[PDB]
Design a protein around this ligand. Sequence first.
Ligand code: HEC
Length: 108
Amino acid sequence: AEFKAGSAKKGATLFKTRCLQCHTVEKGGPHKVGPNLHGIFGRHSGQAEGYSYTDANIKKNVLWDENNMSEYLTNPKKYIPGTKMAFGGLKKEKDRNDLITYLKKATE
Ligand code: HEC
């Protein structure tokens, strides 16, 4: 994938509609169904403390950046077979770009 910068404002509405039920982004926000996403960028998958990941997510051992995140959110199970993240995917390029723009800033 090729991340282009988008609207953080729409990315927040995208996050809050499609991600917030399973995730938080603030520093020190609680783990829910999924882990807190603070400092997700520049961190390998499966390394947030306090959350029990799938083996699949740990062994993927992917250093998250803008681009591989875009691929992941298109179809999570396809990028990480075995993941227990039950999310179909953000199919539209512009929605993924909008969200990741928000996510960069919101996870500090
Ligand atoms: C539950 C109904 C979820 C929804 C909706 C979304 N996510 Fe999720 N996510 C969820 C789980 C249970 C997990 C753990 C996966 C595992 O196999 O252990 C995840 C994982 C992620 C990750 C990876 C984080 C890591 O530390 O490796 C990311 C980046 C992530 N989720 C982001 C994310 C976004 C952006 C969502 C909506 C757009 C979203 N998730 C929805 C559970 C659920």
